[PDB]
Amino acid sequence: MKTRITELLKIDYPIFQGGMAWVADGDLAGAVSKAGGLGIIGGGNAPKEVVKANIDKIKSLTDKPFGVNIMLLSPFVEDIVDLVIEEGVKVVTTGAGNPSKYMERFHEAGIIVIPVVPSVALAKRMEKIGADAVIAEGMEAGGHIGKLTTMTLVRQVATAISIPVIAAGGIADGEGAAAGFMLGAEAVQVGTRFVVAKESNAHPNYKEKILKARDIDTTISAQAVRAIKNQLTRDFELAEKDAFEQMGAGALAKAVVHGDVDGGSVMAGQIAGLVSKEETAEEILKDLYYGAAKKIQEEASRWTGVV
Amino acid sequence: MKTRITELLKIDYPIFQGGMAWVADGDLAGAVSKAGGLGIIGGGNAPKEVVKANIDKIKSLTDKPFGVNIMLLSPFVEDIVDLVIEEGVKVVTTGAGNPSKYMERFHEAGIIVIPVVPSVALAKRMEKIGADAVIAEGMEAGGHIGKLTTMTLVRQVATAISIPVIAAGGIADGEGAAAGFMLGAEAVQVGTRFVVAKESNAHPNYKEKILKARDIDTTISAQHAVRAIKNQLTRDFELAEKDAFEQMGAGALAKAVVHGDVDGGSVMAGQIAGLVSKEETAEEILKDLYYGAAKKIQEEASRWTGV
Ligand SMILES: O=C(O)COc1ccc(-c2c[nH]c(CNC(=O)Nc3ncc(Sc4ccccn4)s3)n2)cc1
Ligand SMILES: O=C(O)COc1ccc(-c2c[nH]c(CNC(=O)Nc3ncc(Sc4ccccn4)s3)n2)cc1
Ligand SMILES: Cc1cc2nc3c(=O)[nH]c(=O)nc-3n(C[C@H](O)[C@H](O)[C@H](O)COP(=O)(O)O)c2cc1C
Ligand SMILES: Cc1cc2nc3c(=O)[nH]c(=O)nc-3n(C[C@H](O)[C@H](O)[C@H](O)COP(=O)(O)O)c2cc1C
Ligand SMILES: [Ca+2]
Ligand SMILES: [Ca+2]
Ligand SMILES: [Ca+2]
Ligand SMILES: [Ca+2]
């Protein structure tokens, strides 16, 4: 099977493992790319030399295509722009801001640019400035969120633009992934579920937090970031009532690296209640792709001959 | 095609026009039922005598199945429970609370009860007291909302229960409706788009504000949290909360729906309002949703064939 995304990136499955701060090292990314998806290295707030070690890690693991995520609120944003170009990266995703100022530089470098868009207006602007595709991220996602859900944003983005759309936010199995294709997308982007992958270097405490979570276990803090509820999210809310960087500084690192799941930031999506097994990256990819195929096929049998 | 909902309810299409305070009178619920879906009179906050007039109006328009919505925050809840049983209404949907104390009375009346549920724990419990089906409503929906999205709530509720699930929130076309079926749903509930139906008695001003809205033109107010299209009321209400209500809130929806005061009334509508761009008959809407979905499911299955 083929979609414009499998053709554009030269990959087996129309699935991205979304770039994540701290979680998406060369190990996670490498395992995804290896099995046939697009593994994506999360730039995050990391210095150039930390992100570079990751790019080196991945190349030594596989020759398959890979992306690098540039998170536009990073203090080292300009260094990572240099880096993706310098290291020969073919795909760039961008998140948490407008990447417009870097678009011509990326395209002169032969790089494929796929921004994350939170609205139809920004989706269209990206199309008119040359963007090769866009990612519509719903508010149900883990991490730094917009306002619109996946249901409404994907459909309205897909309708507004002629470039290919990718659904992100709230997908953790084949049924969820196939829904993304119905809303008009040609690829899915998955975050929360890849965190529990065997190759993921997220601390056992962070993985077990996700695994035990119920549907309602997430909250939005710092109004904006979706995370699993703990002492830190309760602290922040209370200090929101009172009125602050003592809490917020290094919070994700505390969680992802050191396993402090009380005082750390345990970002994860509303779909974490559906995630309850540790698997390899390949086992996750196959479940999403063949799980979707199966469900699309079963529904077509139901609706067959209707006109 | 057949779903467990089409067979429980004996309806031609697995689509509910969602029970809506003020909007969902007899003429709208009639046209939906007459065209072959499930039209639903919304009880809202209305006295027993007003809802009876609606029930009286619908029976004279169509012989086909119809539902009545019981909104549980109503001052007149006990009377609307009475009313449905006395007038031989065969289906009841509920919203804004827990209907558990009414379950045994409804079933002794031979009534089919379909509660809206905001979580997995409430879906499971409704299943355990004998509910015939539930509605999963996402926070993207118009009106009074929970915290989970359609993408994530419908997945996790379809998964937790063996009774049929109906997907609500963010569906205005066949691609949207197909997506809901993909997540585990056996029918869809549509609100926003039915407001602009030719047979809807919503004020031309109110229909105009939907037709001209963008994806981003809704906001959450009063977080009883209501989703509505941004205007002077939402601006004044947000500010009134900001520094710190019944003077502003009282009768707000009636002012917009009936009188067309879309400046200072509550224009409840979903994030999918940016997609709703024309006035159509109820039948034209039902047919677009149904056959739109069919063609999208059929299209994607030829794309995925052999996988
Ligand atoms: O320019 C504007 O204001 C509008 O433009 C945009 C606004 C928002 C977005 C957007 C929303 N979501 C995303 C992708 N998701 C994310 O970026 N989620 C993230 N999680 C953890 C992150 S790390 C971090 C975060 C904050 C501070 C320091 N570090 S980023 N992009 C894209 C474009
Ligand atoms: O266990 C509990 O605490 C109660 O559980 C529930 C909690 C929430 C819900 C729920 C949320 N949304 C829905 C279905 N949607 C709606 O109920 N939407 C509505 N729009 C306009 C309405 S009219 C109104 C509303 C408030 C005050 C005065 N009038 S109701 N049900 C259902 C059950
Ligand atoms: C822990 C965590 C960190 C993330 N970091 C980034 C990031 O640095 N840049 C970005 O564009 N998106 C970031 N995201 C979003 C993901 O790339 C992806 O779009 C999202 O997880 C999809 O939603 P889901 O969690 O339901 O699967 C992050 C998400 C999580 C959960
Ligand atoms: C104006 C308006 C009034 C509503 N009133 C009720 C109600 O009284 N009881 C209820 O259970 N749901 C109510 N709802 C929810 C709808 O029946 C339906 O589930 C919802 O609108 C679906 O989301 P959508 O707007 O994206 O289609 C209302 C929705 C709107 C837009
Ligand atoms: Ca398109
Ligand atoms: Ca490891
Ligand atoms: Ca089920
Ligand atoms: Ca009329």
Short mmCIF file of C-alpha atoms in Angstrom, two decimals, chain A residues 141-145 219-227 233 265-268:
data_model
loop_
_atom_site.label_atom_id
_atom_site.label_comp_id
_atom_site.label_asym_id
_atom_site.label_seq_id
_atom_site.Cartn_x
_atom_site.Cartn_y
_atom_site.Cartn_z
CA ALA A 141 -1.79 14.83 22.99
CA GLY A 142 0.96 14.62 25.62
CA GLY A 143 3.10 17.74 26.13
CA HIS A 144 2.60 21.32 24.93
CA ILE A 145 -0.94 21.48 23.49
CA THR A 219 -4.56 17.22 33.45
CA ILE A 220 -3.67 20.53 31.72
CA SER A 221 -1.23 22.63 33.76
CA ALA A 222 0.48 26.04 33.43
CA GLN A 223 -2.30 27.93 31.66
CA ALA A 224 -0.21 24.75 28.58
CA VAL A 225 0.98 21.16 28.95
CA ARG A 226 -0.87 17.83 29.32
CA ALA A 227 0.71 15.47 31.88
CA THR A 233 0.59 19.28 38.83
CA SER A 265 6.72 16.36 34.73
CA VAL A 266 5.07 13.15 33.45
CA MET A 267 3.78 14.33 30.07
CA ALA A 268 1.52 11.78 28.40
#
